[PDB]
Design an enzyme around this catalytic site. Structure first.
Site, mmCIF file in Angstrom:
data_model
loop_
_atom_site.group_PDB
_atom_site.id
_atom_site.type_symbol
_atom_site.label_atom_id
_atom_site.label_comp_id
_atom_site.label_asym_id
_atom_site.label_seq_id
_atom_site.Cartn_x
_atom_site.Cartn_y
_atom_site.Cartn_z
ATOM 1 C CD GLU A 134 5.381 -10.456 35.241
ATOM 2 O OE1 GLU A 134 6.523 -10.025 35.500
ATOM 3 O OE2 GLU A 134 5.179 -11.539 34.662
ATOM 4 C CD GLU A 271 9.728 -9.870 33.054
ATOM 5 O OE1 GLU A 271 10.192 -9.609 34.203
ATOM 6 O OE2 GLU A 271 8.853 -10.751 32.857
ATOM 7 C CD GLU A 305 14.579 -8.276 35.268
ATOM 8 O OE1 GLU A 305 13.562 -8.181 34.562
ATOM 9 O OE2 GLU A 305 14.614 -8.939 36.317
ATOM 10 C CD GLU A 327 9.536 -14.620 36.408
ATOM 11 O OE1 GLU A 327 10.774 -14.686 36.482
ATOM 12 O OE2 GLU A 327 8.937 -13.569 36.084
HETATM 13 ZN ZN LIG Z 1 11.812 -13.086 36.135
#
Ligand SMILES: [Zn+2]
Ligand SMILES: *[C@@H]1O[C@H](CO)[C@@H](O[C@@H]2O[C@H](CO)[C@@H](O)[C@H](O)[C@H]2NC(C)=O)[C@H](O)[C@H]1NC(C)=O
Ligand SMILES: *[C@@H]1O[C@H](CO)[C@@H](O[C@@H]2O[C@H](CO)[C@@H](O)[C@H](O)[C@H]2NC(C)=O)[C@H](O)[C@H]1NC(C)=O
Ligand SMILES: *[C@@H]1O[C@H](CO)[C@@H](O)[C@H](O)[C@H]1NC(C)=O
Ligand SMILES: *[C@@H]1O[C@H](CO)[C@@H](O)[C@H](O)[C@H]1NC(C)=O
Ligand code: NA
Ligand code: NA
Ligand code: NA
Ligand code: NA
Length: 856
Positions: A134, A271, A305, A327
């Site tokens: 990511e 995650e 997570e 987020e």
């Molecule tokens: Zn995050």
């Protein structure tokens, strides 16, 4: 002549399934891959564009009981794309399979498919390979349609030596010996998901596991020498996974969840679906040596997570302009979940502090709306910032309060259920929330324009007048739908008023002695009181401060100093308000006081201001002296009491409060006489080490114990102490050695650079080091990364002279394409501009206030 000139991929070629074969060699540090991707085309085309970055493409073919043909390969490295040219135009709606063979080098950064190392407690170096994709690094490990809306299933196969273990998103379903000394691991096919969630690790990790009540096998993996520190995170993960499954009423869909502690890791955690990854310090817990802050941090990181398994993996933002849907929600869910699963942590009281951190950057012209356009990888990485995480969670908390928890929960469940295995936009969230009230119009004001309002309150008898205006340091016509709340001297019921216009009014039922808006600081706005307002509230805090809640007292402290910066309140009046803290007891108001007052002497430290700096620090110590003196030199009490103890003893020692220094010196001498074998209270160790590291002998002894420590807290405490020395040659050595990554790992460098940047004598060295080593630091950490932003702000954002401002403007200007356009650069420039104005106006006022200061 490349046939695609856009950064965004074409929309008409769509992947459905990937088969990934990866053969990595942890001796030569190379890997080979074969990628087959089942695709169907929405419309006829002869060209297929996808992502590939630093991958050598040896061959590419197209497969239609029949048929296979070769594809010509062109590359555009700056667009990070390759083009596959087919001989016949592709046919709409027919399933094809693209087969790509390629080779790469293990990355030497912290992203892509990268090398990590560690030393066994005997001295043997060991190598492992791990992933971090990511946002845009999956394309460095396999060619892919590397945008989060191109979801697909993934069948991963890893070839490796018998001595290594491989893990990935899904369970291992089969291992086949393919050649002498080569085994091929087959992992089960994933659910539909984005490419940035793919993960795999080749290591010699060990593990411990526990089963959830729903049958999910949860495991923590770590290097053999540290697996005995995995028990806390394992228990927390099982509890939190079970909480989310019951909260959302949407089961976790995979058979297992792994939490892996990686010896080199750039961020704190990630995650990846079924295989979440962590810095060792964010996951591993030593019951004898870990801090209370560490236990809190591990719990919240795991909660974050695991929240992402729903907010991010199951439902994903359509494009990075809406990253906050991932987020902000994961950050908010930390507090929702942990307040239930670990009530003793009392995480609810820490939340508002994140909102004030967001307001620090969001008051600047160089902030951005929560939802805002991005295109290239640097810009995308810049979205992982305080606006996405902290403002995102804060406006969600404000919305939850406005709607009620039950209506909010119903909204997010309908949102998750309706968009499962798909992607969402800003608008989709509001539509789901409204399905339960014009949420969309309101929340558009909070997500499509930057900043926040100042709410000004003017009382005439029972008539309460309200005005909103954009708060900017230091007139755009911005307008919000603001869900105001207030209490009064006559009613502690939380009263609500939706301010939708520039001005409005409400009528109290009876006159009151005071009124206080933004109850519990659940609103993303600040408040000014005209006329006798701030005098009345200052008197409340000094007389009966418990007439309002701890968090309301913290909000008053924070807002008073924010109003100094825009000329609505004098520094003398805000400092006068802060004096009530002499009678305060609560971590949050005391912490808020420290967080407003410390930054003032941090500015003075970088100026020729030793007289006022010393008097200011003596004022701070005197303000809190009764609380300091009551602290015991133990690990007793709650997590909040332990964090307060540790911070107060550190503060007092570093500012040379002699009772604390003398006790810290005694503990350090005994610790050294014990050969570092003495068990100190964890809560006093920061202060003890920080004092001890002030001498050459103590610094050298502390460093000598860092090598062999297996404790993340102890290493963190040693690092902090070593960075506090006034010995410039030692400071330069820390920079050089953590930059090199042998004696101190490079993952610690951004924190070491910032700590030295905050060191009262080391700050010139850190800014110098950043300038001189910029290119290599960018290569390691990446433009737009949070790490680079932390280094930029941590070395520069406490300067307050025009000469320093030009150093910063001139240096980053000279970087052109390699950094001149960073958002963190504009943010630090604007911060220094504000520091200049703030110090120019307020320094002599503070000097006089301190002398007049006979109250103490
Ligand atoms: Zn995050
Ligand atoms: C991995 O690193 C090696 C470095 O050894 C790269 O190989 C070199 O590539 C250049 C240009 O293609 C050649 O002129 C050299 O002869 C190569 N070196 C060797 C030892 O063969 C390789 O390109 C890198 N791989 C990727 C995918 O970037
Ligand atoms: C990585 O490469 C090394 C060498 O390039 C491989 O090691 C060889 O393994 C075979 C069979 O196990 C031995 O007969 C050779 O003597 C080894 N050579 C060396 C130089 O050690 C290793 O197997 C490769 N690993 C993977 C996963 O591909
Ligand atoms: C904020 O930035 C924009 C563009 O960068 C500029 O037009 C505007 O004048 C700035 N505002 C202030 C107060 O400087
Ligand atoms: C001190 O040394 C002993 C013997 O090696 C060890 O078992 C013990 O854990 C050590 N204590 C601390 C606090 O490091
Ligand atoms: Na690569
Ligand atoms: Na806003
Ligand atoms: Na914003
Ligand atoms: Na002032």
């Amino acid at each position: 002549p490349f046939p695609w000139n856009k950064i965004r991929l074409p929309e008409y070629v769509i992947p459905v399934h990937y088969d990934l074969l990866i053969h990595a060699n942890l001796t030569t540090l190379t890997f080979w891959g074969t990628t087959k991707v089942e695709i169907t085309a929405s419309q006829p085309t002869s060209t297929i564009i996808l992502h590939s970055h630093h991958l050598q493409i040896s061959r590419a073919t197209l497969r239609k009981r029949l048929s296979e043909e070769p594809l010509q390969v062109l590359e555009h490295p700056r667009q990070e794309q390759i083009a596959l040219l087919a001989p016949e135009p592709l046919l709409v709606g027919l399933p094809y399979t693209v087969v790509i063979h390629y080779a790469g080098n293990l990355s030497e950064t912290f992203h892509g498919f990268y090398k990590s190392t560690y030393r066994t407690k005997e001295g043997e170096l060991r190598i492992l390979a791990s992933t971090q994709f990511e946002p845009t690094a999956a394309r460095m490990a396999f060619p892919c349609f590397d945008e989060p809306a191109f979801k697909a299933s993934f069948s991963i196969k890893i070839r490796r030596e018998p001595r290594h273990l491989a893990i990935s998103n899904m369970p291992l379903v089969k291992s086949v010996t393919v050649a002498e000394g080569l085994i091929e691991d087959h992992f089960d096919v994933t659910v539909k998901m984005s490419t940035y969630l793919v993960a795999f690790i080749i290591s010699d990790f060990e593990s411990v596991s526990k089963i959830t009540k729903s049958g999910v096998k949860v495991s923590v993996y770590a290097v053999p020498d540290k697996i005995n520190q995995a028990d806390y995170a394992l228990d927390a993960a099982v509890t939190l996974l079970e909480f989310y499954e019951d909260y959302f009423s949407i089961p976790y869909p995979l058979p297992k969840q792994d939490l892996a502690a990686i010896p080199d890791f750039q961020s704190g955690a990630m995650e990846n679906w079924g295989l979440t990854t962590y810095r060792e310090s964010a996951l591993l817990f030593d019951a004898e040596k870990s801090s209370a802050s560490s236990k809190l941090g591990i719990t919240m990181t795991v909660a974050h997570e695991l929240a992402h398994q729903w907010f991010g993996n199951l439902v994903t933002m359509e494009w990075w302009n809406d990253l906050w849907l991932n987020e902000g929600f994961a950050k908010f869910m930390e507090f929702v979940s942990v307040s239930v699963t670990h009530p003793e942590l009392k995480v609810g009281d820490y939340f508002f502090g994140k909102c004030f951190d967001a307001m620090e950057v969001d008051a600047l012209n160089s902030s951005h709306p929560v939802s805002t356009p991005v295109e290239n990888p640097a810009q995308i990485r810049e979205m992982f910032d305080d606006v996405s995480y902290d403002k995102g969670a804060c406006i969600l908390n404000m919305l939850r309060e406005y709607l009620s928890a039950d209506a909010f929960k119903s909204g997010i469940v309908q949102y998750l259920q309706k968009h499962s295995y798909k992607n969402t936009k800003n608008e989709d969230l509001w539509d789901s929330m409204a399905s339960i009230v014009d949420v969309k119009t309101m929340m558009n004001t909070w997500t499509l324009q930057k900043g926040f309002p100042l709410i000004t309150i003017t009382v005439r008898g029972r008539n309460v007048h309200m005005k909103q205006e954009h708060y900017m340091k230091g007139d755009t016509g911005y307008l919000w739908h603001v869900p105001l709340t207030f209490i009064t001297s006559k009613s502690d019921m939380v009263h609500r008023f939706l301010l939708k216009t520039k001005t409005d009014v409400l009528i109290l039922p009876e006159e009151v002695e005071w009124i206080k808006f933004n109850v519990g600081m659940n609103g993303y706005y600040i408040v000014h009181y005209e006329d006798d307002g701030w005098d009345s509230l200052t008197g409340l805090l000094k007389g009966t401060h418990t007439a309002v809640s701890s968090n309301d007292r913290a909000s008053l402290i924070n807002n008073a100093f924010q109003l100094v910066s825009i000329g609505k309140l004098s520094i003398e009046k805000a400092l006068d308000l802060s004096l009530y803290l002499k009678h305060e007891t609560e971590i949050m108001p005391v912490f808020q006081g420290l967080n407003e007052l410390i930054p003032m002497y941090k500015l003075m430290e970088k100026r020729d201001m030793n007289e006022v700096e010393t008097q200011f620090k003596a004022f701070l110590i005197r303000l809190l002296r009764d609380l300091i003196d009551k602290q015991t030199w133990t690990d007793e009490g709650s997590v909040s009491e332990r964090m307060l103890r540790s911070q107060l003893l550190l503060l007092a020692c570093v500012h040379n409060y002699q009772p604390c220094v003398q006790r810290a010196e005694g503990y350090f001498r005994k610790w050294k006489e014990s050969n570092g074998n003495l068990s100190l209270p964890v809560d006093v160790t920061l202060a003890v080490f920080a004092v001890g590291a002030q001498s050459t002998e103590g610094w050298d002894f502390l460093y000598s114990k860092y090598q062999f420590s297996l404790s993340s807290t102890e290493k963190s405490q040693i690092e902090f102490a070593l960075c506090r020395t006034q010995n410039k040659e030692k400071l330069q050595w820390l920079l050089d050695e953590s930059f090199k990554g042998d004696k101190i790992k490079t993952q610690e460098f951004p924190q070491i650079l910032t700590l030295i940047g905050r060191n009262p004598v080391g700050y010139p060295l850190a800014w110098q080091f950043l300038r001189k080593n910029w290119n290599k630091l960018v290569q390691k950490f990446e433009l737009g990364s949070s790490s680079i932003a932390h280094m930029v702000m941590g070395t520069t954002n406490q300067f307050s002279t025009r000469t320093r401002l030009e150093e910063v403007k001139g240096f980053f200007s000279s970087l052109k394409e390699n950094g001149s356009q960073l958002r963190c650069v504009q943010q630090t420039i604007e911060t220094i501009e504000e520091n200049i104005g703030w110090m120019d106006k307020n320094f002599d006022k503070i000097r006089v206030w301190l002398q007049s200061e006979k109250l103490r």
